[PDB]
């Protein structure tokens, strides 16, 4: 599909699509780039994440609108169209999970790449869990938790407490606990420990690293304000 296009041209077109706010295009360019089989640089991993974040973010917001309407109603149309949007969302999550399993994660040896991809695996199972019902929901939740836990274990061993990758993983795992796993205390404990550990490490940073880390710390704080 993007098999005939040069890797470098796919990356170039992904950045153009980002400028144009054409996130479905950007995601398809980045899927093509991944399927070239080469590992992704830091910049390229960020392009991949931004593209699919935006695509699934749209689908999630739409699914929430439709599910709200369907709940209020409780003919077949609202259910039918919520299911169409749900299926397309699951498809996008399955596509991203597929890229990570074939073969991004297994080739990723450095902590910055491995933690990034395992956080992504956690996040896309987490979006699957948001629309899942029943027992099915359990196995998906456990997949998300496992991915996030492996990423946390590597990040705590390999990265400083202020590393933005590590801080963003902890932010999302804390949201997983509060919103998916019905564990608001675990969510608050994680976000509070993560914030306090980063605070203590800020003195080590340059002005630009300080701004990157404090930005994500503020997100942990905003959640802690919401949750306490």
């Amino acid at each position: 599909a993007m098999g005939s296009m040069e890797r470098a041209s796919l990356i170039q077109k992904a950045k153009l699509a980002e400028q144009a706010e054409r996130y479905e295009d950007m995601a398809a360019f980045m899927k093509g780039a991944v399927e070239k089989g080469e590992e992704l640089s830091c910049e390229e991993r960020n392009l991949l994440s931004v593209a699919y974040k935006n695509v699934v973010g749209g689908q999630r917001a739409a699914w929430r609108v439709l599910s709200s309407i369907e709940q209020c109603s409780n003919g077949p149309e609202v259910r039918e169209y919520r299911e169409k949007v749900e299926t397309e969302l699951q498809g996008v999550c399955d596509t991203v999970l597929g890229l990570l399993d074939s073969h991004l994660i297994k080739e990723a040896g450095d902590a910055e790449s491995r933690v990034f991809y395992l956080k992504m695996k956690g996040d896309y199972y987490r979006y699957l869990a948001e629309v899942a019902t029943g027992d099915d929901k359990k196995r998906i939740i456990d997949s998300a938790r496992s991915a996030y836990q492996e990423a946390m274990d590597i990040s705590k061993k390999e990265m400083p407490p202020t590393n933005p990758i590590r801080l963003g993983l902890a932010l999302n795992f804390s949201v997983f606990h509060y919103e998916i796993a019905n564990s608001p205390e675990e969510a608050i404990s994680l976000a509070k420990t993560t914030f306090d550990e980063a605070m203590a490490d800020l003195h080590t940073l340059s002005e630009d690293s300080y701004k990157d880390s404090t930005l994500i710390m503020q997100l942990l704080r905003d959640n802690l304000t919401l949750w306490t």
Partner: peptide, 4 residues
């Protein structure tokens, strides 16, 4: 409440 997640990143981004």
């Amino acid at each position: 409440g997640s990143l981004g």
